Design a protein around this ligand. Structure first.
Ligand SMILES: [Cl-]
Ligand SMILES: [Mg+2]
Ligand SMILES: [Mg+2]
Lengths: 415, 415
């Protein structure tokens, strides 16, 4: 099957481009908007519409493969590629990438994805978001050519022989950590709520006392609201390094604190994302490794999820190798070509590291469908319900795709 | 080409099933839930998860057509089919419709959709949600057989010789009529905000003063936040009959009051949905017609959008024939077969009535893509951004689908 055409359309995402540098300097509030001057190049406002590029591969048989280019909300922030304005990046795809695809015979997903993930123009690598879209399109093209699900393609090429099963769906609440919890309970998230505990005083408490009461509220809320008695989701709470800050990164003091969180969470199981956030990757690994080893040596039944300083596939291998937490976050848009997600997940598996197949609230419905398929195929420990902060939509996009994929795969076994 | 297999999966939606009867009975808000006894049959809490049924037709070439069965959030309410629980209706599909689809030749969309729309079981019509889902799936099957967009199939069969263009996108705010407005301005909604003015004293104001003030605020908000000065969206406010109630359905008084909103909305054009809500369909048509008469005769360029008592295709024909409003809401989930959306729009356009291609917050990402296609094909006046109350997600689904479909058609025009 040849590719005969390549179309690009600009688009929306499930959220916003936020000027992080402006927000961290003290950008004020006004309704759903931020105020004051923009700090980051390219921004016209501190908050503006998040953008995507839909990449369409017209196939020889007339089918159309579809992937979406997207970046995180903090597009163009520290250590990221420039603000992903479709206007700036459609011309690159149309003049540098499309001619490399038109007339190409569709081969396996792995080699083609890798070619396009590493490709250079003027000796310079492609914007992560473009690699993200183009490889999603390529995966969808392989799947359509072979008449199977994207999951199945990824399984064949990255996880030979394995079963494809449902993956636990993790929902994120943002600051509305009470109302969106209700949403998640009612939509039966397998993992919840993130809770956006990004403030020591306001959100954690100076002694961690606020999060402690939140965990108790959360446990009770589930017991009260759940339709089915046997619905028992896993707690996943992101403390943006505030446990570290509130306890001066004292390994033992953090673990003692975390133990009381666990006591408060029971009967439910507790995952804490980003306990600490220290000053370099080496020392983040060490602090995660040792806090895990502390928790583990004492038999405190809480898991740590890596985030801060764990970005690249190389990072994923580094945190994995060194058991720097119990779960490593695989950051789908940041990794560029979606083949890297599968590589990263499969490394985690091979080394017994829990794999959180993540994403951004600022990507699309399509990009979410694709990476869900990857998550399923590689047996990730959980996948993010995404995009958007509405919760319902993100859960629907991700779980419905999961459900249909399992239906189709199961049909194929009995043929 | 035939359909070779049918798969049904249970799914989520962008929203919830709410027991409307209980909500009117006085169910108290608690977080994102409602307290107390359910009043409607089949409900187990006053708010429960929205449910969908993804319908997949496997065709003999190995492509998979996908349609989503979905109902309104007030599933099971007055004049409605029973609460659309997946577990209740999947077996109906599997037993009664799958055998009729497996082995069926793909001919044209129109006769296939009509057969399945009007299909009976033990003498009784099928649930509107099943008809909704099945016909979507059929439409997609037809498109995939012909290797064209869903829009092009509908254009070919209902709107011959027409171009397919972008359609104004309308966003709903729900009660958060302030912050969600900000969203819509940042995402550049063509029509906004709905505003859920569903209460006389709290929302409209007794003498209309609250809506008037909200209009003023809305106008300033757009001028305040718009990225580019020539963004001039259309105001569309739903008032749930309350202008009728506050002004004793007096035509002159209502005409006078909308004139003031119109004046307060300038430079922005205003549409008011459901100005009144009377005792029966006949008196509803008359009030709509006479109110439009007054405004038109007085040259107040503000429009009236029909809703209440305008439900089926005969109703849309009824409101069209008697110029009862300037626009009519085509209620996509409620109409069953999606072929009926095409018939209703095209009637409206043959007789110079605005066609509002609607939907629900409680349908799916897929149903929204499909009916968006129908809207474009028949050249609707506007389409609802949907599903979900998040706003961002429903705008992305609807508008990103819109842009891709136009890119594909434009390509086909140059082939
Ligand atoms: Cl909240
Ligand atoms: Mg984190
Ligand atoms: Mg209405």
């Amino acid at each position: 099957m040849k590719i005969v055409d390549v179309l690009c359309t600009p688009g929306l995402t499930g959220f916003y481009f936020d000027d992080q540098r402006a927000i961290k300097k003290g950008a004020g509030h006004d309704g759903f908007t931020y105020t004051g001057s923009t700090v980051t190049e390219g921004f016209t406002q501190v908050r503006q519409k998040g953008e995507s590029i839909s990449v369409l591969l017209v196939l020889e048989d007339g089918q159309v493969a579809h992937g979406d280019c997207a970046a995180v909300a903090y597009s163009g922030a520290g250590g990221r590629d420039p603000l992903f304005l479709a206007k700036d990046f459609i011309p690159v795809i149309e003049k540098e990438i499309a001619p490399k695809l038109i007339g190409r015979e569709i081969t396996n997903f792995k080699p083609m994805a890798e070619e396009f993930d590493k490709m250079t123009v003027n000796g310079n690598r492609l914007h992560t978001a473009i690699r993200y879209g183009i490889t999603q399109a390529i995966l969808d093209a392989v799947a359509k050519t072979r008449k199977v699900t994207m999951a199945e393609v990824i399984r064949d090429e990255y996880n030979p022989g394995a079963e494809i099963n449902a993956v636990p769906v993790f929902a994120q609440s943002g600051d509305d950590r009470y109302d969106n919890v209700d949403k998640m309970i009612i939509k039966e998230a397998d993992v919840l709520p993130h809770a956006l505990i990004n403030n020591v005083e306001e959100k954690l408490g100076l002694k961690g006392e606020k999060l402690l009461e939140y965990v108790k509220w959360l446990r009770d809320r589930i017991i009260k609201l759940r339709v089915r008695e046997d619905y028992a989701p896993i707690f996943h709470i992101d403390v943006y390094g505030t446990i570290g800050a509130a306890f001066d990164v004292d390994i033992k003091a953090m673990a003692d604190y975390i133990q009381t969180l666990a006591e408060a969470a029971k009967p439910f199981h507790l995952r804490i994302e980003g306990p600490m956030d220290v000053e370099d990757r080496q020392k983040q690994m060490e602090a995660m490794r040792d806090l895990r080893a502390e928790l583990d040596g004492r038999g405190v039944d809480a898991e740590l999820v890596a985030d801060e300083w764990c970005n690249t596939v190389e990072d994923v291998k580094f945190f994995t190798d060194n058991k720097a937490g119990h779960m490593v976050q695989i950051k789908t848009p940041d990794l560029g070509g979606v083949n890297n997600i599968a590589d990263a997940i499969m490394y985690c598996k091979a080394n017994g590291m829990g794999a959180y197949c993540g994403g951004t609230c600022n990507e699309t419905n399509r990009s979410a469908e694709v990476t869900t398929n990857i998550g399923m195929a590689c047996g990730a420990r959980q996948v993010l319900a995404k995009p958007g902060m509405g919760v319902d939509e993100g859960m629907m996009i991700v779980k419905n795709e999961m459900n249909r994929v399992l239906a189709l795969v199961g049909r194929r076994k009995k043929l």
